[PDB]
Design an enzyme around this catalytic site. Structure first.
Site, PDB file in Angstrom:
ATOM      1  N   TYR A 199      23.538  58.962 -56.401  1.00  0.00           N
ATOM      2  CA  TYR A 199      22.705  59.308 -55.248  1.00  0.00           C
ATOM      3  C   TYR A 199      22.736  60.748 -54.821  1.00  0.00           C
ATOM      4  O   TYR A 199      21.708  61.274 -54.443  1.00  0.00           O
ATOM      5  CB  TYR A 199      23.083  58.516 -53.999  1.00  0.00           C
ATOM      6  CG  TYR A 199      22.708  57.076 -54.060  1.00  0.00           C
ATOM      7  CD1 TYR A 199      23.675  56.110 -54.335  1.00  0.00           C
ATOM      8  CD2 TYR A 199      21.386  56.666 -53.877  1.00  0.00           C
ATOM      9  CE1 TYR A 199      23.344  54.766 -54.411  1.00  0.00           C
ATOM     10  CE2 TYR A 199      21.047  55.318 -53.959  1.00  0.00           C
ATOM     11  CZ  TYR A 199      22.028  54.379 -54.225  1.00  0.00           C
ATOM     12  OH  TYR A 199      21.674  53.047 -54.276  1.00  0.00           O
ATOM     13  N   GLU A 232      30.460  48.745 -59.106  1.00  0.00           N
ATOM     14  CA  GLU A 232      31.181  49.707 -58.244  1.00  0.00           C
ATOM     15  C   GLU A 232      32.568  49.237 -57.772  1.00  0.00           C
ATOM     16  O   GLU A 232      32.820  49.083 -56.560  1.00  0.00           O
ATOM     17  CB  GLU A 232      30.327  50.127 -57.042  1.00  0.00           C
ATOM     18  CG  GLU A 232      28.968  50.657 -57.410  1.00  0.00           C
ATOM     19  CD  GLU A 232      28.152  51.002 -56.198  1.00  0.00           C
ATOM     20  OE1 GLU A 232      28.385  50.439 -55.091  1.00  0.00           O
ATOM     21  OE2 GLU A 232      27.264  51.839 -56.348  1.00  0.00           O
ATOM     22  N   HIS A 274      28.685  41.340 -57.635  1.00  0.00           N
ATOM     23  CA  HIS A 274      28.154  42.418 -56.790  1.00  0.00           C
ATOM     24  C   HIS A 274      28.654  42.196 -55.359  1.00  0.00           C
ATOM     25  O   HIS A 274      27.915  41.758 -54.474  1.00  0.00           O
ATOM     26  CB  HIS A 274      26.627  42.428 -56.863  1.00  0.00           C
ATOM     27  CG  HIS A 274      25.995  43.745 -56.516  1.00  0.00           C
ATOM     28  ND1 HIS A 274      26.142  44.359 -55.290  1.00  0.00           N
ATOM     29  CD2 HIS A 274      25.180  44.550 -57.243  1.00  0.00           C
ATOM     30  CE1 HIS A 274      25.434  45.481 -55.272  1.00  0.00           C
ATOM     31  NE2 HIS A 274      24.851  45.621 -56.446  1.00  0.00           N
ATOM     32  N   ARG A 333      17.207  44.585 -63.141  1.00  0.00           N
ATOM     33  CA  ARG A 333      18.651  44.418 -62.982  1.00  0.00           C
ATOM     34  C   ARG A 333      18.881  43.567 -61.742  1.00  0.00           C
ATOM     35  O   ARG A 333      18.467  43.926 -60.649  1.00  0.00           O
ATOM     36  CB  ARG A 333      19.371  45.781 -62.845  1.00  0.00           C
ATOM     37  CG  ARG A 333      20.892  45.618 -62.711  1.00  0.00           C
ATOM     38  CD  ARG A 333      21.687  46.947 -62.691  1.00  0.00           C
ATOM     39  NE  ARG A 333      22.999  46.618 -62.145  1.00  0.00           N
ATOM     40  CZ  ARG A 333      23.565  47.198 -61.084  1.00  0.00           C
ATOM     41  NH1 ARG A 333      23.005  48.244 -60.486  1.00  0.00           N
ATOM     42  NH2 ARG A 333      24.736  46.757 -60.647  1.00  0.00           N
ATOM     43  N   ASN A 369      25.736  54.622 -61.045  1.00  0.00           N
ATOM     44  CA  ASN A 369      25.016  54.622 -59.782  1.00  0.00           C
ATOM     45  C   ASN A 369      25.121  56.008 -59.144  1.00  0.00           C
ATOM     46  O   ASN A 369      26.228  56.437 -58.805  1.00  0.00           O
ATOM     47  CB  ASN A 369      25.618  53.572 -58.840  1.00  0.00           C
ATOM     48  CG  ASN A 369      25.357  52.148 -59.302  1.00  0.00           C
ATOM     49  OD1 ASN A 369      24.635  51.918 -60.272  1.00  0.00           O
ATOM     50  ND2 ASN A 369      25.941  51.180 -58.601  1.00  0.00           N
ATOM     51  N   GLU A 428      21.384  52.706 -60.588  1.00  0.00           N
ATOM     52  CA  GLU A 428      20.949  52.755 -59.219  1.00  0.00           C
ATOM     53  C   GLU A 428      20.681  54.193 -58.962  1.00  0.00           C
ATOM     54  O   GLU A 428      21.467  55.088 -59.214  1.00  0.00           O
ATOM     55  CB  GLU A 428      22.161  52.348 -58.404  1.00  0.00           C
ATOM     56  CG  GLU A 428      21.874  51.721 -57.089  1.00  0.00           C
ATOM     57  CD  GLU A 428      23.184  51.617 -56.341  1.00  0.00           C
ATOM     58  OE1 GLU A 428      24.055  52.459 -56.386  1.00  0.00           O
ATOM     59  OE2 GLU A 428      23.361  50.471 -55.519  1.00  0.00           O
TER      60      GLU A 428
HETATM   61  C1  LIG Z   1      24.378  50.663 -54.529  1.00  0.00           C
HETATM   62  O1  LIG Z   1      23.829  51.316 -53.392  1.00  0.00           O
HETATM   63  C2  LIG Z   1      22.844  50.597 -52.616  1.00  0.00           C
HETATM   64  C3  LIG Z   1      22.409  51.472 -51.440  1.00  0.00           C
HETATM   65  O2  LIG Z   1      23.528  51.694 -50.565  1.00  0.00           O
HETATM   66  C4  LIG Z   1      23.426  49.254 -52.170  1.00  0.00           C
HETATM   67  O3  LIG Z   1      22.465  48.515 -51.415  1.00  0.00           O
HETATM   68  C5  LIG Z   1      23.813  48.484 -53.435  1.00  0.00           C
HETATM   69  O4  LIG Z   1      24.349  47.208 -53.101  1.00  0.00           O
HETATM   70  C6  LIG Z   1      24.863  49.254 -54.212  1.00  0.00           C
HETATM   71  F1  LIG Z   1      25.124  48.610 -55.396  1.00  0.00           F
END
Ligand SMILES: *[C@H]1O[C@H](CO)[C@@H](O)[C@H](O)[C@H]1F
Ligand SMILES: [Zn+2]
Length: 471
Positions: free
Chosen positions: A310, A171, A125, A81, A308, A381
């Protein structure tokens, strides 16, 4: 080590990849014909980024892309990606095409395919051409739907005979939140901010324009290119989990409000054709209204949803009250909590917001499955960071990251085995890279990059993936 994970542990044809973004890895920021983005301007202002660093060189993937593709193939990944820099293709965001920029992405795409790696290509992005910000006011202007659609149309025409998996945006919530509520990312707008702004209104205007722009670009794909090209277009949304602190009606309602204001903001439009009811009720006339026609254009406009993921937070709440609007963030009427029964929700990685909470992955994926009719999801992500100033060998022995991926993938597997329609998973990131406000002080890669020599060295987590993913 693998903890029972392997290709066999996931569905047939499940896609595993790694992810980068253009500004974070390419370098050649003011070379090869590329025009500036809003991030070039932001990063070049003293004090804006850790160490006054910027993406001018970054990892120099622009020169080294064959090395990096060779590496991802050697680690047994199926897909990559990456994003196309809008200002590398159209230096002014509209008008003249930079043929050198086009050639770079052709070369990258062709080499990926030569090496058996599927390209998953994001159009945007965080890197709006600076010319568009200045001329039009960027995402505050509804004209962005046309401007973005023309850019997307060019990319579809030029690359779509080879690229079959697209995303429009990465995002939009983060652009709205950090660019227009808190004012900590470009264009640095907020109620108190030097650049101007209004934290109560602008985040909602911006979100709305991302949704309309996504819908317009997809309509162009479907009507002009899809019959011949037979590809797909999705969108990438961030979602971190919210867990009620207790089983009280108020805490449960708070956690649900957070989900709605976080992911519902985009998913209710994209899946159901309207904003979440609670956002309608609380944000009122500050939340733009889709016309029936616009709602029908937006509904069903994502062929898959990139998530995405985390982390997770506990949420505490009380009775909803009438309040003078101040900000998107304040509109949720929730209280964040990061400990329960005297224990933190998880340990932190280098990034302060990143609590290691593997069950948040299950929480998120199960929630989308149950609430939104089990749409096709791709985890676009997931990863964690090491701090600055370690030795090469300390970076390589990334045992915490190995544990992170084993635990989070175990939780994803749990959701998939319960029926969640997840089609793939992408590790952020292939390479240590430019981490926005943190500059080069945050290391998210499974591959270590020495930022003095630009040498690549796979970390233990890279070899973990190689072993897990072997065919
Ligand atoms: C998603 O999270 C990461 C880690 O913070 C960023 O580097 C990416 O640009 C973001 F899309
Ligand atoms: Zn170079």
């Amino acid at each position: 080590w693998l903890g029972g994970l392997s290709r066999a542990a996931f569905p047939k044809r499940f896609v595993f990849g790694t992810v980068t973004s253009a500004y974070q890895v390419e370098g050649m920021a003011a070379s090869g014909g590329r025009g500036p983005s809003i991030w070039d301007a932001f990063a070049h202002t003293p004090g804006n980024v850790a160490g006054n660093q910027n993406g001018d060189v970054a990892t120099d993937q622009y020169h080294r892309y064959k090395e990096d593709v060779n590496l991802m193939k050697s680690l047994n990944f199926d897909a990559y990606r990456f994003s196309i820099s809008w200002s590398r293709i159209f230096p002014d965001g509209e008008g003249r095409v930079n043929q050198e920029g086009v050639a770079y992405y052709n070369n990258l795409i062709n080499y990926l395919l030569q090496k058996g790696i599927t390209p998953y290509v994001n159009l945007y992005h965080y890197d709006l051409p600076l010319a568009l910000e200045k001329k039009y006011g960027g995402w505050l202007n509804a004209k962005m739907a046309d401007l973005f659609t023309e850019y997307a149309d060019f990319c579809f025409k030029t690359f779509g005979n080879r690229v079959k998996h697209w995303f429009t945006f990465n995002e939009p919530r983060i652009v709205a939140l950090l660019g227009y509520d808190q004012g900590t990312n470009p264009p640095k707008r907020c109620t108190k901010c030097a650049a101007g702004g209004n934290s109560a209104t602008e985040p909602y205007i911006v979100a709305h324009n991302f949704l309309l722009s996504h819908a317009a670009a997809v309509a162009r794909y479907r009507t002009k290119y899809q019959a011949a090209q037979q590809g797909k277009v999705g969108i990438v949304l961030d979602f971190n989990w919210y867990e009620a602190l207790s089983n009280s009606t108020e805490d449960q309602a708070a956690a649900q409000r957070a989900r709605d204001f976080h992911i519902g903001w985009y998913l209710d439009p994209l899946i159901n054709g309207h904003y979440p009811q609670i956002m309608q009720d609380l944000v009122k006339d500050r939340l733009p209204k889709f016309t029936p026609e616009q709602a029908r254009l937006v509904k069903g406009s994502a062929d898959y949803i990139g998530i995405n993921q985390y982390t997770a937070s506990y949420m505490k709440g009380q009775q909803l009250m009438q309040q003078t609007p101040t900000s998107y963030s304040a509109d949720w009427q929730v209280t964040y909590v990061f400990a329960k029964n005297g224990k933190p929700i998880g340990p932190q990685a280098n990034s302060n917001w990143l609590y290691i909470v593997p069950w948040g992955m299950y929480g998120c994926v199960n929630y989308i499955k149950q609430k939104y009719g089990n749409p096709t999801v791709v985890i676009t992500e997931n990863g964690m960071d090491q701090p600055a100033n370690l030795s090469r060998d300390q970076y390589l022995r990334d045992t915490t990251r190995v544990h992170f991926y084993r635990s989070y993938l175990t939780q994803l597997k749990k959701a998939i085995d319960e029926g969640a329609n997840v089609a793939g998973y992408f590790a952020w990131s292939l390479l240590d890279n430019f981490e926005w406000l943190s500059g080069y002080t945050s290391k998210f890669g499974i591959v270590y990059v020495d930022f003095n020599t630009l040498e690549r060295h796979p970390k233990a987590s890279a070899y973990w993936f190689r072993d897990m993913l072997k065919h």
